């Protein structure tokens, strides 16, 4: 790892993918299919629809396969089919490749209580994972009951992730104590939280902020503000720490149709080092103590 220099090559937002396809993929595939632009034609909007619906990942190879398939069908139609030239349209795309696949850009849009979005820098690029929580035992078995709510974790988490979860649990309990002592929910209630796997082990802790906010949302029941994401390692006191894969998480977030994003103050430079269109239309938020995150996600 240390013996050379590592150079990053990361992701392609819808615009970048569209440009790549127009200038690079379509001609190369056409040549692979032995065709002429006169005979086969694909509008840009068709490529936009493909990317937005028929391929969901930072890479582009799957888009290559889809465009290759449609060109193959066009070639078959040419050699024998009546049509002498092909002008692909959003109307004919269905017959050319079939009905759409990724109809929903996101898992959902409501984000009920006890679930929050987060950004994971998984090996296969960036992804948006929902971290959810739930109450798997009665909140008040007996109002006297004073035994602390046990916590259970799902997701094949490594001991490092388990410790991060415990830290987040303790800090969330303390924050609820300060903000609302009357609410013992997070204290006297056994809780089960699921953090989807796929995050590279190094990036695992990054979901600490997500876990804390999910637990708080469950405790107060206030659903987190929609079209919101976040990421950050928690400090057991409420200070946030930087994380890696910032560009990858940003591109994944934008692809997920999310608007307001939360990052630690430290990574700020990396967020600005990106391009403009990549950063276009993102209500970013840079924080250093968890209190600001609580204020943001819960405007009241």
């Amino acid at each position: 790892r240390d013996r050379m220099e590592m150079i990053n090559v990361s992701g392609y937002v819808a615009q970048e993918k569209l440009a790549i396809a127009e200038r690079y993929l379509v001609p190369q595939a056409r040549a692979l299919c032995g065709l002429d632009e006169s005979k086969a034609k694909l509008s840009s909007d068709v490529l936009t629809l493909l990317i937005k619906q028929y391929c969901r990942e930072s890479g582009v190879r799957n888009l290559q396969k889809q465009v290759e398939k449609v060109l193959r069908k066009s070639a078959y139609k040419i050699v024998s089919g009546e049509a002498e030239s092909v002008e692909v349209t959003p109307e004919n795309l269905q017959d050319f490749v079939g009905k759409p696949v990724f109809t929903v850009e996101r898992m959902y849009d409501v984000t009920p209580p006890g679930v929050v979005m987060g950004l994971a820098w998984t090996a296969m690029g960036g992804s948006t994972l929902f971290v959810e929580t739930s109450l798997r035992r009665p909140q008040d078995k007996d109002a006297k009951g004073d035994k602390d709510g046990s916590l259970e974790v799902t997701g094949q988490l490594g001991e490092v992730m388990k410790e991060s979860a415990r830290i987040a649990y303790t800090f969330a309990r303390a924050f609820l104590m300060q903000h609302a002592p009357a609410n013992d929910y997070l204290v006297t209630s056994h809780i089960h939280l699921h953090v989807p796997e796929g995050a590279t082990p190094k990036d695992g802790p990054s979901a600490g902020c997500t876990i804390v906010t999910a637990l708080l949302s469950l405790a107060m029941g206030r659903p987190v503000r929609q079209n919101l994401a976040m990421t950050g390692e928690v400090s057991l006191t409420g200070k946030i720490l930087p994380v890696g894969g910032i560009k990858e998480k940003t591109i994944a977030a934008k692809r997920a149709g999310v608007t307001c994003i939360v990052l630690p103050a430290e990574n700020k430079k990396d967020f600005y080092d990106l391009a403009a269109f990549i950063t276009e239309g993102l209500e970013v938020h840079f924080v250093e103590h968890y209190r600001e995150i609580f204020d943001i996600a819960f405007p009241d």
């Binding site: 299919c33 032995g34 193959r72 070639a75 078959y76 050699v79 024998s80």
Partner: protein, 186 residues
């Protein structure tokens, strides 16, 4: 062994689309998608002119016609047909022969296929791909990868024979009941 191998033996291929469509419709029922892909392959092989070959795998329950439809495709394209059972195999040597120095050394089964077919652009059908063992001193998965590499294939070679072989025009079909068990690179 060497001279018996073909060199430039581009076994002739039919190109009448309607002919192949009728042939397949007669030899099998339904199975539309496979016929669609085959017609697309014929059309591209025609427009491109020179014949070529790629790698596609039929995955599904057993005894559904995968082998039968492979035979029908070999018939329709007029090219040779050969099958190779890979499930429960470890030694790539059978795939790659031996060094040719061991006592009673023989070349890799692909060499036998090439000789028997006596052609440069045959059809090969790998049976039960996902049942590879890839265990100790095995891991032929690397050998299969180089075999299916759309570029390394052009200069593939084995242990017994130490000369490159071009296979870009060769047609490969692979069969397996399930998808996931296949190694991701393949």
């Amino acid at each position: 062994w060497l001279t018996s191998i073909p060199w430039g033996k581009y076994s002739n291929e039919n190109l009448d689309l309607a002919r192949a469509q009728a042939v397949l419709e007669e030899d099998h029922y339904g199975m539309e998608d496979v016929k669609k892909r085959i017609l697309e392959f014929i059309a591209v092989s025609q427009l491109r002119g020179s014949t070529q070959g790629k790698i596609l795998c039929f995955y599904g329950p057993p005894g559904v016609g995968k082998t039968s439809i492979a035979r029908s495709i070999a018939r329709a394209l007029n090219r040779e047909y050969f099958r190779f059972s890979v499930g429960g195999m470890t030694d790539v040597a059978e795939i790659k022969g031996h060094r040719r120095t061991y006592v009673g050394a023989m070349p890799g089964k692909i060499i036998q296929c090439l000789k028997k077919t006596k052609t440069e652009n045959p059809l090969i059908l790998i049976d039960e791909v996902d049942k590879i063992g890839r265990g100790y001193q095995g891991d032929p998965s690397s050998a299969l990868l180089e075999l299916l590499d759309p570029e390394q294939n052009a200069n593939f070679l084995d242990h017994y024979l130490d000369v490159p072989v071009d296979l870009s025009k060769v047609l490969f079909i692979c069969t397996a009941n399930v998808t996931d068990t296949i190694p991701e690179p393949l």
